[PDB]
Design a protein around this nucleic acid. Structure first.
Lengths: 70, 72
DNA sequence: AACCCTAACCCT
């Protein structure tokens, strides 16, 4: 069973999730096995989609919250 | 390094339906058990926002309960 | 990698 979770993000939060050259979001894709989409735009209010089996969603979520805590 | 976070999740109304539960009993138990502040945007929408806030571990506990809810 | 920091990090 694959779940699809959408988070709402602020653009500052989003930058640290992508990281320099996308190296952070790269790491997250590889290590979580979640499909991660970050809405295209230099926009003030951004959507992060996480899709996959529960373990993948959980890994990806845990990594996002570690980024936001800094 | 913040010890409190706020996460928002974008949810369809049928999903919010199961998260709240009958007489709000599922979100009551999530609140009590996670220790997170859980806000569900009000009313009748089709497209609702769930805000989780509190200690990181509280966030993660609430989120798991949300997921556990959604996969049933 | 550098006298090579921070503030901003923008990828599928």
């Amino acid at each position: 069973v694959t779940l699809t979770i959408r988070l709402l993000m602020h653009g500052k939060e989003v930058g640290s999730i992508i990281g320099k050259k996308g190296e952070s979001v790269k790491k997250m894709r590889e290590e979580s096995g979640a499909r991660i989409n970050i809405s295209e735009g230099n926009c003030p209010e951004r959507i992060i989609t996480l899709a996959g089996p529960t373990n993948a969603i959980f890994k990806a979520f845990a990594m996002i919250i570690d980024k936001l805590e800094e």
